[PDB]
């Protein structure tokens, strides 16, 4: 909305809101990220202190598909099936049917351990597990499978 800008409220003012001593000239210190170490150094020092230099080894053709490992914590495991299913099997133990929360179907590969789990047995089928994730699943009375 051009009618809502400051140009329409600065009609009549000579400098159009830019000052009389310091005019609105073409450049205010260069074109782009100029002077990264000379006159805009204090800007880069203040707001991007690690902009200049090198760090870490070069990976000539990085395979970002090999680093794709979505993770879900234990506290969010039962939300994969539902709250009604959770209450349906809330009184199961060893010997009877226990629902299997396979996480690869939901797009989660590694299961992490954070938060708390409901006091029910469960079978967690996932590609990778954490050391503290397996403890919480087994301490509640469940099992940790593996896939692929």
């Amino acid at each position: 909305a051009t009618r809502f800008r400051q140009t329409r409220r600065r009609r009549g003012h000579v400098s159009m809101g830019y000052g009389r001593i310091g005019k609105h000239r073409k450049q205010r210190g260069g074109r782009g990220n100029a002077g990264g170490q000379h006159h805009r150094k204090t800007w880069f020092t203040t707001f991007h202190p690690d902009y200049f230099g090198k760090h870490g080894m070069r990976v000539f053709h990085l395979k970002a598909n090999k680093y794709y490992c979505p993770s879900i914590n234990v506290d969010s495991l039962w939300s994969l099936v539902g709250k009604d299913v959770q209450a349906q099997y809330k009184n199961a133990k060893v010997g009877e049917e226990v629902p299997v929360i396979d996480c690869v179907k939901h797009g989660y590969f590694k299961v992490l351990g954070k938060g708390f789990l409901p006091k029910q047995p469960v079978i967690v089928r996932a590609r990778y597990f954490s050391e503290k994730a397996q403890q919480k699943i087994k301490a509640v009375g469940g099992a940790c499978e593996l896939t692929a």
Binding site: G12, H13, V14, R20
Partner: protein, 129 residues
Amino acid sequence: IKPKIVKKYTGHFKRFDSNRFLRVKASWRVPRGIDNRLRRKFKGTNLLPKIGYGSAKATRNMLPCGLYKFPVRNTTDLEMIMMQNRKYAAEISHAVSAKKRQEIIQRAKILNIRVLNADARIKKQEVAQ
């Protein structure tokens, strides 16, 4: 009953240097010059519009007859100020024909509503009549 309508300045606020130059019209413009005589309020030339010049709220936008203004374009427009004939006054629009003006004028007398254009766009009843 009619109050005293008091105006704090009855003149016109003319644009600075409008009298000297014809390209500069008389419609007011606040001078933004860094060395302008008027905007620095020099003695002799310190006449600028201010909110302090505003007239009393009770008697604002009120015609000398003591009533406000309410434009009308047809007879049905008059029906919106029939309850307030002592507060408003009809003002026929400048484009309303002479034939329609008589119908508005006749109805306004019936509804006891004043008309400010009562002698407007009349026929030639000034000479040879």
